[PDB]
Design an enzyme around this catalytic site. Sequence first.
Site, PDB file in Angstrom:
ATOM      1  CE  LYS A 130     -11.515 -10.181   4.759  1.00 22.93           C
ATOM      2  NZ  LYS A 130     -10.662  -9.184   5.509  1.00 22.93           N
ATOM      3  CG  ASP A 183      -4.873 -12.866   6.133  1.00 23.63           C
ATOM      4  OD1 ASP A 183      -5.762 -13.309   5.384  1.00 23.63           O
ATOM      5  OD2 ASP A 183      -4.621 -11.679   6.278  1.00 23.63           O
ATOM      6  CG  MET A 203      -0.471  -5.926  -7.091  1.00 22.24           C
ATOM      7  SD  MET A 203      -0.666  -5.279  -5.387  1.00 22.24           S
ATOM      8  CE  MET A 203      -0.687  -6.825  -4.484  1.00 22.24           C
ATOM      9  CG  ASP A 217       1.783  -1.152   3.506  1.00 23.53           C
ATOM     10  OD1 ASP A 217       1.118  -0.958   4.551  1.00 23.53           O
ATOM     11  OD2 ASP A 217       1.411  -1.936   2.618  1.00 23.53           O
ATOM     12  CG  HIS A 269     -10.514 -12.601   0.993  1.00 23.95           C
ATOM     13  ND1 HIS A 269     -10.206 -11.395   0.335  1.00 23.95           N
ATOM     14  CD2 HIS A 269      -9.850 -12.555   2.153  1.00 23.95           C
ATOM     15  CE1 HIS A 269      -9.366 -10.677   1.095  1.00 23.95           C
ATOM     16  NE2 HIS A 269      -9.146 -11.387   2.234  1.00 23.95           N
ATOM     17  CG  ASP A 297      -8.949 -12.416   6.364  1.00 22.37           C
ATOM     18  OD1 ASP A 297      -8.627 -13.544   5.811  1.00 22.37           O
ATOM     19  OD2 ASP A 297      -8.539 -11.212   6.182  1.00 22.37           O
ATOM     20  CD  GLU A 301      -7.472  -8.837  -2.042  1.00 22.30           C
ATOM     21  OE1 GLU A 301      -6.630  -8.038  -2.512  1.00 22.30           O
ATOM     22  OE2 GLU A 301      -7.370  -9.621  -1.052  1.00 22.30           O
ATOM     23  CD  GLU A 343      -6.389 -12.905   1.097  1.00 25.55           C
ATOM     24  OE1 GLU A 343      -5.829 -11.842   0.816  1.00 25.55           O
ATOM     25  OE2 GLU A 343      -6.745 -13.131   2.245  1.00 25.55           O
ATOM     26  CG  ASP A 374      -2.705 -10.396   1.724  1.00 33.17           C
ATOM     27  OD1 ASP A 374      -2.186 -10.054   2.791  1.00 33.17           O
ATOM     28  OD2 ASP A 374      -3.716  -9.793   1.398  1.00 33.17           O
ATOM     29  CG  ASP A 413      -3.769 -11.437  -2.531  1.00 28.59           C
ATOM     30  OD1 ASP A 413      -2.937 -11.122  -3.390  1.00 28.59           O
ATOM     31  OD2 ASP A 413      -4.300 -10.530  -1.857  1.00 28.59           O
ATOM     32  CG  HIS A 442      -1.701  -1.227   1.412  1.00 30.13           C
ATOM     33  ND1 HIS A 442      -1.216  -2.406   1.949  1.00 30.13           N
ATOM     34  CD2 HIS A 442      -2.998  -1.474   1.102  1.00 30.13           C
ATOM     35  CE1 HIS A 442      -2.162  -3.316   1.948  1.00 30.13           C
ATOM     36  NE2 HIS A 442      -3.265  -2.773   1.454  1.00 30.13           N
TER      37      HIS A 442
HETATM   38  O1  LIG Z   1      -8.172  -8.737   3.881  1.00 33.31           O
HETATM   39  C1  LIG Z   1      -7.313  -7.813   3.650  1.00 33.31           C
HETATM   40  C2  LIG Z   1      -7.030  -7.855   2.162  1.00 33.31           C
HETATM   41  O2  LIG Z   1      -6.624  -9.124   1.836  1.00 33.31           O
HETATM   42  C3  LIG Z   1      -5.877  -6.898   1.818  1.00 33.31           C
HETATM   43  O3  LIG Z   1      -4.629  -7.320   2.345  1.00 33.31           O
HETATM   44  C4  LIG Z   1      -5.769  -6.654   0.313  1.00 33.31           C
HETATM   45  O4  LIG Z   1      -5.218  -7.744  -0.406  1.00 33.31           O
HETATM   46  C5  LIG Z   1      -4.992  -5.399  -0.072  1.00 33.31           C
HETATM   47  O5  LIG Z   1      -5.446  -4.182   0.456  1.00 33.31           O
HETATM   48 MN   LIG Z   2      -5.504  -9.985   0.000  1.00 36.15          MN
HETATM   49 MN   LIG Z   3      -7.302 -12.070   4.062  1.00 38.19          MN
END
Ligand SMILES: OC[C@@H](O)[C@H](O)[C@@H](O)CO
Ligand SMILES: [Mn+2]
Ligand SMILES: [Mn+2]
Lengths: 385, 385, 385, 385
Positions: free
Chosen positions: A181, A255, A86, A55, A218, A253, A179, A215, A285, A243, A52
């Site tokens: 979610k 991750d 990206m 970041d 997600h 979520d 993306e 992702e 990610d 992702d 980002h």
């Molecule tokens: O759930 C959070 C999302 O996965 C983010 O990390 C996006 O990939 C980017 O903003």
């Molecule tokens: Mn993501």
């Molecule tokens: Mn996620």
Amino acid sequence: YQPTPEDRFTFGLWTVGWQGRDPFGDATRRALDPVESVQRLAELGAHGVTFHDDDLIPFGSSDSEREEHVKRFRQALDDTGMKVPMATTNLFTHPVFKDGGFTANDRDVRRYALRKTIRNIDLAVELGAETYVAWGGREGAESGGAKDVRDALDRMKEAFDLLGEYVTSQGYDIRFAIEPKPNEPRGDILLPTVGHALAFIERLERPELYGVNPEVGHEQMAGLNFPHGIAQALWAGKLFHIDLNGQNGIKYDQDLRFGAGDLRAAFWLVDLLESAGYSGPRHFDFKPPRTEDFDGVWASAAGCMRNYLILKERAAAFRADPEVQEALRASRLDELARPTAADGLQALLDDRSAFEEFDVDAAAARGMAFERLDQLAMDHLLGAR
Amino acid sequence: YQPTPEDRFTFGLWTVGWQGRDPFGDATRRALDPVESVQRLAELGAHGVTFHDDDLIPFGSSDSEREEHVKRFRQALDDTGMKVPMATTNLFTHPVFKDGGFTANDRDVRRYALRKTIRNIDLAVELGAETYVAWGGREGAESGGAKDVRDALDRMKEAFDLLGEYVTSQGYDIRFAIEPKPNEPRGDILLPTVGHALAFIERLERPELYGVNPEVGHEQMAGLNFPHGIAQALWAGKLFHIDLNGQNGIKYDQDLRFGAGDLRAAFWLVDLLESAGYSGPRHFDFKPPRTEDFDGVWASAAGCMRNYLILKERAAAFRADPEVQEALRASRLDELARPTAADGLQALLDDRSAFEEFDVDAAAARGMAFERLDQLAMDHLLGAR
Amino acid sequence: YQPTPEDRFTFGLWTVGWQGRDPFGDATRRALDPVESVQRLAELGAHGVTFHDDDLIPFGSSDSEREEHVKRFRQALDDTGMKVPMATTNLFTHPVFKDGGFTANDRDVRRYALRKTIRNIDLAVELGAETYVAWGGREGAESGGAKDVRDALDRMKEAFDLLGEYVTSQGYDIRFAIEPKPNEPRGDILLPTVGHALAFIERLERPELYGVNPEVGHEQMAGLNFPHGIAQALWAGKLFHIDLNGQNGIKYDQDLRFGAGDLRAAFWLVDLLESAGYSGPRHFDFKPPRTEDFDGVWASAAGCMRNYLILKERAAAFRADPEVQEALRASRLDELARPTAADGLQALLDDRSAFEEFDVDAAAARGMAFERLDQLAMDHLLGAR
Amino acid sequence: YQPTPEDRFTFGLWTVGWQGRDPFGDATRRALDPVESVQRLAELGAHGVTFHDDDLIPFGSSDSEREEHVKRFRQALDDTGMKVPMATTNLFTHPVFKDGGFTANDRDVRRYALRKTIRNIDLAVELGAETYVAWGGREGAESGGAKDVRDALDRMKEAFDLLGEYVTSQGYDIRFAIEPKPNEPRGDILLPTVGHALAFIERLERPELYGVNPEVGHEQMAGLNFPHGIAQALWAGKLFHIDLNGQNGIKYDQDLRFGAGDLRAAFWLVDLLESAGYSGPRHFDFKPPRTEDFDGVWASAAGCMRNYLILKERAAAFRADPEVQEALRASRLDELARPTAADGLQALLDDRSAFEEFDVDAAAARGMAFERLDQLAMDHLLGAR
Ligand SMILES: OC[C@@H](O)[C@H](O)[C@@H](O)CO
Ligand SMILES: [Mn+2]
Ligand SMILES: [Mn+2]
Ligand SMILES: OC[C@@H](O)[C@H](O)[C@@H](O)CO
Ligand SMILES: OC[C@@H](O)[C@H](O)[C@@H](O)CO
Ligand SMILES: OC[C@@H](O)[C@H](O)[C@@H](O)CO
Ligand SMILES: [Mn+2]
Ligand SMILES: [Mn+2]
Ligand SMILES: [Mn+2]
Ligand SMILES: [Mn+2]
Ligand SMILES: [Mn+2]
Ligand SMILES: [Mn+2]
């Protein structure tokens, strides 16, 4: 199982850099310098990083500080040979985005979210990124009267259409990847799945500028089959980026590192990306669990890469195994790939073997032999052949 | 709260006719004659019925028996003034369809599934239906190697494209409505959500022939917001038909009467269909619980209609209440409906109030007033104003 | 990876015998004779079988037919060396049980459900079973006013208390194992999880007669961690029996072969049963998918056994690996197993190093090293050490 | 619908005081002074408040500052007539608790977590609380080798047993209430449901000191029926306290105001607490959405109380309605409450009407009339009688 940069493995600055602040708990790790993470990720065999805006350049940085942060960062990319495939915008952290960016109810906020975006597309192009991700994490609602969804899609389509005007006016080679979610941090998030994102793109003025960034975790938060959604994205020509991570079912979520969570899903996803010849970045990610110190960070990023390469080897052995190709014919995968009626509609309608004389009992009796196939795929995964 | 046929309430023959056979249990009710159900549903105030082929004509009926069954049925429609707005094919019960109809791995099965379909489109048009539903309940897999999803979408698109050729060649006024479901009876079903179905239609040769038939309980089986998916379908112009029922969360497909399950979802869905001016059938695709005798059947069908009409009254009172319209302005719904940048891209880029001089703190401090709005909507639902 | 009967693998008659009737579809396989399945399961290396009453003796059989069915069955057990470790009652199929057996609202039904049970405990003891399972699949509700849950637990406790009186009065060595399930075929089922069943047993007159029969797929239908629930059952001394199968998340009850579904769960469950020294039957309560013919049946039952034995080998290699035992000490598993305060309460209260002088920062900084541990366990599973 | 303090409504300091920091976003509201919230909550009609240690006294406060904070707080309780019925420990925020408190793998951490607890039980008793809650939010794991669950239950039982020794040694009238949660912030949390907590209490040295604090949203995060779990807690004598809030299905822990989420669940829960004569606090453990300013805070806390009082009125009208009591007899609720076999085991065994001469067909034919009952309960909720 050693990665090299030719494997196309990438990581977000925010992933290894997650301080481990969660809804119930303070940070457990200090902030990493972006420089540091570039150096440490190049040593582990990664191909590049992503960011980002926020970041890389602290929110509210003067233009004197922006340039500094960018200089430093670029030196570390030069010193390491890392790329930036990206980039994306943070339109979720600051309180101004508490109702969304592109679909916030306040119109002022909405113009501010597109200005903050456009600024970072310039930087992204400077740094060589090919794909610009947009995760609308604040676009949605906790309540039914808070958001009219038809007006909110009009707004979303207007924001994406102005970004596609911007990019074609500047001459930039850069595509957008939306993306999906389904929820978190909003009660419900708009375009909650791959299929909703795919559908929406087909309404934008220039749809060939936009694809999807799915992702793992997600689509699993909706209980959906991640390899089936990516097949559909591949079938539409719209898998711009991906992702990779792990998720244990329908819950917050998580991750987790890639390979954790649903490990058979992980196997069929590598099978598919490798047999379709996906050639974009394999981006991670993920968040190293807040239980870990910096040692556990770099262990967790390394296991993402390892687990991809192990599953690539086992999917390749699977498809290359004659006894497997025999099973696939026994289960009629070959026939799935043939047209149902290349003869056309009229000939179908005149074919008595299709209906009047079709023996439904005999057809119904044939076994599909799927279980033997599936166990072959299990013995392959586990290396128990 | 008395329905009349002008409310456009419809029911499948299979809904009131469900004998209550479940994965663990035998039938608990005898089979209804289609005649009977037409008569009993007209007395309760319904507007029409719908059918699978196989609900109306027993599987394997001679053409002498087909015509009989159809005659009888048509007399009962004449005697009652009931309509037939929609029909569909059973491509899930018989064992020949154990791997699917249009995406079965056997090509013979696939041609048989399109011949069985085409036969029932003729009958559907004869009986005056406007919409032809397709629920691909056997299209999918329990295992990853059993189905290549890209070949299976090629097959699905080929079958829908031949049905669109058939209908335009015959001159028929009839459209197709694809019904998504995420799982059950397959481990995973293809086009599992509204968004996947929407996306897929945009790849067919004639997309303006196809829309979606969403069902309440199906998108809730993925944990998704049913009124948000229907908004998206409305936004695309593709809400051809709708299935109404109730579902308590992510579990097997319960098919409870409409209003049961998620009752606030039910409120925001009626709010939306009524404020968008949806004018297709309000179809009930429900099963009276196997605990019930025929008395409990007709009670359960009557409560579907009742609960729609109660929620219509409370959503209408909600939107008509000045204090509500004041709340909506306090929460900036009005601003959501205004373009973000009708001024265009250049003017956005030159507007300093959008960025350089935008006061992010002041904007971030403003409350959205959503909770007061939501409680107004709760007091309205409960009649506690 | 060859099973032998010393591995203690068992199967229900109803598992390999499932004809593949589902909520949307007719049978796809003919009925197996119980004789047949005993013979075919002994050839594959199984140790025994289990039954409902109604699997072995057709519902409503005269006592002349019961004895016949039992004779035949017993001959096939003699001819094959198969055992019968467990039996259970069908109190879910027949329509009389549409509101439950032991908690039906009709008191007549309830007495009938205990008489039908007692009859089959006699037969179970005759055939040598040690464990008598009770899955209350119809005990529950689709609606809130249909069932008062406190009265329904009184009824359930009364039925189990009379069965414990029966068994101690006859002198029988047989224990009861209650099987939880959260939903399906009822909207909600009473004692929906392991923890609810455990809690309930502690209220029966003789709690040492009752334990739990957990099933993989049932606790995963609530999104719970199956190895964590079995640990708790082990910790209480109450793991009398176990049902093994696979399930992909929160959805209808799939009953896939063991190892399918959540394969890392499967690994940690074998790790635990083997390290705790569980010595009851490894029973498979699965359904070969209706896509399969009898070839695919016996393939699917064989892969249950195979996948157990592969995961046993990899969990044993995991715990035996010095680098793993080193990791476990690095992550302080050793310290988890030491008492927190064997010194007692007073000494804890006087210990300044516990509070007044405890350095919270230093403690907080230590990493838990969990990710390195987890990757070791992944490399072990996949055989990639 | 005006609350008064006789309604027994309470709130945690942390609920109205939530600054709106979430996994993706900064605070959106300033910190409230505890004083402020006491004053504002007394004006709205609340009966008292509750606290973590760390809500009232900042982490690391000198004993000079502790006493100050406590003085001030006590003055505001005196000035307002608010009570403190319940208190609890924060053993989740600080990084030292990243692996848990009572089950952390480090033994030092574990002793520190019991010392920090004991300190706050003293204060709780000083301030008059009757119930001491323990939510083990960090007790659990993201990975299978990280935690041996049997050792972790030994630790948990040791910590609760030392706290029960402490309280009986001091003479205190205070009971413990364990709060289950299935996941978040840990991947899986130990004692994840009401039933697991109930089961665990029956293993502590003094079980009559401990009961459960269930929360609406937590059992719904497992997809379970919250009123069924509370019935079971009531049936065991163990409902010491309750947390009230709303949750839309299986996803992250939303903590919406009470009445939001599952509104029919909310109706059957008030029905039950009111008909069982639950007389503890009706505590709200909710977070006003981060979209809101302080106006929206106090609106959201007020709607918790309002929605309880509306649902109490409609459940009371439901049970008081003769046509409802007639329906209940039609559906045999009366018979559910009668013993199945007060005659005893022998008489059951000799009763031919229970078996030999029981007419199963006639019994199976009777309808349960549940749907008519359920619609009555719907018309009551909606006020449409
Ligand atoms: O759930 C959070 C999302 O996965 C983010 O990390 C996006 O990939 C980017 O903003
Ligand atoms: Mn993501
Ligand atoms: Mn996620
Ligand atoms: O889940 C079953 C589906 O809802 C069907 O009833 C379709 O609507 C029509 O075949
Ligand atoms: O879900 C069905 C249950 O698992 C049953 O098979 C029980 O184990 C035995 O009646
Ligand atoms: O999910 C968070 C928990 O609900 C806590 O608020 C407890 O109730 C108290 O520590
Ligand atoms: Mn359905
Ligand atoms: Mn439907
Ligand atoms: Mn099962
Ligand atoms: Mn079972
Ligand atoms: Mn909560
Ligand atoms: Mn709580």
